[PDB]
Design a protein around this ligand. Structure first.
Ligand SMILES: [Ca+2]
Ligand SMILES: [Ca+2]
Ligand SMILES: [Ca+2]
Ligand SMILES: [Ca+2]
Ligand SMILES: [Ca+2]
Ligand SMILES: [Ca+2]
Ligand SMILES: [Ca+2]
Ligand SMILES: [Ca+2]
Ligand SMILES: [Ca+2]
Ligand SMILES: [Ca+2]
Ligand SMILES: [Ca+2]
Ligand SMILES: [Ca+2]
Ligand SMILES: [Ca+2]
Ligand SMILES: [Ca+2]
Ligand SMILES: [Ca+2]
Ligand SMILES: [Ca+2]
Ligand SMILES: [Ca+2]
Lengths: 502, 4
């Protein structure tokens, strides 16, 4: 027998795969044919997609077919190569090798594109297009890739919930009649709202009223033993400039003196003037807490605070009611404290047909004009506490404080918040100052520097509690708010309120 | 309990 040799086929292109670009090209095939009785010049034959290609063995045992159609190789992924040789005596032999290759006519095109917008698709793979007549393909998510009359492909990116359990990477595969496919992968990017800063303003009115001296009188009480009312003395209450009865005392003393209240007006400091929208101390209220036999104390007492307002004087009387709790005394010093609660009463008066209201604010620690105002005070047995009795004069019926409203989604000087493509935008956080996160203050009253804000989830707000004396020129409130869209994207902005006085 |  003649001796068969070894016939090998090199990779069909470098990656041993015919792809969509190679599909339209002419491909060189090559291999080796060595050993046995294979001789330079021997015939090499192969059938690929039913076309026979032939060549001869070259020096080095090499063989090459100059040009096979890529379409033939795409149609036929396996073929034998047959070399015909002879030995010296003329015996003939066929040496056979087998070639396989892969066919992958696909190509991918990958994009990352904002939801809710149309996008021109750039840098598409070479040869990309639609089958003839097709001008639109629908993507997996119901978006579209449209071929325009300008030759460009545009993707209409659907809005997605980027917070849920469903991938937001869209895709579509275009199949062409020659076998090519183009897979366009479209990673849809989330959008977000843009909160824009808001400006609002409010002006608190100023007014100076001329007032007479004050005359405070205990005028009535309920319960109590040995109850007396009297104008204060050096020994009981301190002295004041009028004969009105500023002191009240009660109880059968169980140790030394009687419990009671005293009120020393602020006539000297006031200098016959009240101001509008301004916490004013009308006097110093002292609670004298002594031990008295249980059962002998008042439960309430009423004090008339009388003064005149200059227009013609119009007398005004503010009735101040105090609830009194002379608590049974134990060995707990705190539980044995006696408790005074002042009621939130007011009086309305008229000056020049313009009406105003004096309202009780409460008790403020003496000397601390910036201190907290409280309506209940606590005094140890065998002690006296003193507090300024603070009122405020407001315009009208005193039903509300100076206020302004708005909505932070409106254009408030710098444009309206942008809601993004997801929508379902609500306010999820609000805070005084520069920093805000989703929090529990939306729809709740929160305290600023000069007043209180209620900002609701739909952006609506109502905002001044400060006294005029505490509002400097150029005073500004700043509240940070946070808006959030359907799938959690957030944006913050500041609501700035100019607080002026007039 | 007695005094208050
Ligand atoms: Ca290839
Ligand atoms: Ca091509
Ligand atoms: Ca030979
Ligand atoms: Ca074949
Ligand atoms: Ca191969
Ligand atoms: Ca999703
Ligand atoms: Ca698809
Ligand atoms: Ca989204
Ligand atoms: Ca007086
Ligand atoms: Ca008495
Ligand atoms: Ca007096
Ligand atoms: Ca008096
Ligand atoms: Ca007491
Ligand atoms: Ca007590
Ligand atoms: Ca407003
Ligand atoms: Ca805004
Ligand atoms: Ca979003």
């Amino acid at each position: 027998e003649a001796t068969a040799g070894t016939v090998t086929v090199n990779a069909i292109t470098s990656d041993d795969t015919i792809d969509g670009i190679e599909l339209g090209q002419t491909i060189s095939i090559s291999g080796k044919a060595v050993g046995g009785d294979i001789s330079v010049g021997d015939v090499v034959k192969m059938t690929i997609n039913n076309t026979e290609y032939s060549t001869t063995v070259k020096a080095g045992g090499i063989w090459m077919i100059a040009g096979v159609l890529g379409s033939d190789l795409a149609a036929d992924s396996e073929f034998d190569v047959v070399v015909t040789s002879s030995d010296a005596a003329g015996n003939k032999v066929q040496s056979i090798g087998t070639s396989t290759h892969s066919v992958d006519l696909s190509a991918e095109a990958n994009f990352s594109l904002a939801e809710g917008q149309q996008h021109v698709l750039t840098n598409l793979p070479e040869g990309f297009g639609f089958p003839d007549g097709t001008t639109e393909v629908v993507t997996n998510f119901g978006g579209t890739i449209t071929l325009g009359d300008d030759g460009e492909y545009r993707y209409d990116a659907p809005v997605r919930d980027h917070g849920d359990a469903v991938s937001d990477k869209d895709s579509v595969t275009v199949t062409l009649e020659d076998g090519r496919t183009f897979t366009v992968n479209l990673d849809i990017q989330d959008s977000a709202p843009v909160a824009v800063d808001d400006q609002d303003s409010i002006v608190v009115q100023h007014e100076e009223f001329e007032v007479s001296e004050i005359a405070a009188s205990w005028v009535s009480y309920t319960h109590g033993e040995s109850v007396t009312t009297f104008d204060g003395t050096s020994d009981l209450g301190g002295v004041d400039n009028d004969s009105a009865k500023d002191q009240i005392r009660w109880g059968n003393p169980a140790e030394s003196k009687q419990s009671g209240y005293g009120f020393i007006d602020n006539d000297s400091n006031l200098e016959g003037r009240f101001d509008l929208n301004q916490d004013i101390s009308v006097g110093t209220f002292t609670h004298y807490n002594y031990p008295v036999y249980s059962g002998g104390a008042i439960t309430s007492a009423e004090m008339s605070v009388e003064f005149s307002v200059l227009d013609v004087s119009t007398p005004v009387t503010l009735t101040v009611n105090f609830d009194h709790n002379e608590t049974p005394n134990t060995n707990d010093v705190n539980a044995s404290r006696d408790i005074v609660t002042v009621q939130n009463t007011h009086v309305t008066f008229e000056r020049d047909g313009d009406i105003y209201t004096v309202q009780i604010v409460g008790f403020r620690e003496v000397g601390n004009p910036d201190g907290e105002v409280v309506t209940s005070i606590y005094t140890n047995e065998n002690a006296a506490t003193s507090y300024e009795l603070v009122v405020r004069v407001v315009e009208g019926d005193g039903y509300s404080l100076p206020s302004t409203e708005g909505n932070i989604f409106d254009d408030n000087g710098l444009g309206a918040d942008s809601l993004g493509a997801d929508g379902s935008v609500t306010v999820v956080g609000v805070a005084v100052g520069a920093i805000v996160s989703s929090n529990e203050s939306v729809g709740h009253s929160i305290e600023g520097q000069y007043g209180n804000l209620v900002l609701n989830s739909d952006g609506s707000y109502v905002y001044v509690t400060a006294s005029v004396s505490d509002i400097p020129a150029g005073a500004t409130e700043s509240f940070a708010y946070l808006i959030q869209d359907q799938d959690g994207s957030t944006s913050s902005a500041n609501l700035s309120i100019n607080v002026g006085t007039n | 309990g007695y005094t208050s």
